[PDB]
Amino acid sequence: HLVFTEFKQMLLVEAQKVGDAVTFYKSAFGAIESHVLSSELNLAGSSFVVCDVSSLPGFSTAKSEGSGVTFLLGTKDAEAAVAKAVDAGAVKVEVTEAEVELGFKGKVTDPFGVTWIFAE
Amino acid sequence: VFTEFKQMLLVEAQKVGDAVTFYKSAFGAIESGHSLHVLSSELNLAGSSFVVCDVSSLPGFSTAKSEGSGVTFLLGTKDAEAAVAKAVDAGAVKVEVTEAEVELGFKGKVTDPFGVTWIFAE
């Protein structure tokens, strides 16, 4: 019986970006914060960890130009969520008819190459 | 206010089952529910969870698997080499860790069949 003492999802960022990142996440979503340079951020009662890729030996880049990093957020107002994020630097992506069928009413990409879709 | 925050792992068309089966085998993930081939499945693991979903159901997105995705997870465990072999038997590929990677304590590393990099702490 092998067990794991914890499971975290690591959002890699380019060199010296962990700070621009929290900065952007604290703003666009209201995330709450908390060798390897990293910062744990909290949204909806769960967390992720933004990590500086240059501070993780073994890795070469954050793949920010084409990462498959995708998060889902639930809220009561997806339009107001997109607009808040865009005023903070995110780019609104039109939600396909398809995404609207799964209730995914809003969607944006951020400066770190992550894709966030709002599920209402 | 946000009421849920869930990572979405994008995988190859028709492969959500191979992933649901794989994640259970390698890590003992738990399927807390799914939606029908499988369109998506949320997996519980070590107190958290991630959702797996066939990209063919989400046009515009890209798994980024052929060019390396940045999907990275950390899993703390008592025996890293054991978890590495346990994951390799399910189809993952072992990545040797160097001394530089030792100072931090991550004595194992694999990239699963879905392009995810899993670091093991110990």
UniProtKB/Swiss-Prot annotation, chain B:
- Domain of life (superkingdom): Eukaryota
**Is Acyltransferase included in the keywords of this UniProt record?**
no
Per the record, its GO cellular-component terms are: cytosol
Key words, A-Z: Acetylation
Q: Does the keyword Acetylation apply?
A: yes
Summarize subunit and interaction data from the UniProt record for this chain.
Homodimer.
Q: What is this protein called?
A: Uncharacterized protein At5g48480
Annotated source species = Arabidopsis thaliana
Source species taxonomy = Eukaryota, Viridiplantae, Streptophyta, Embryophyta, Tracheophyta
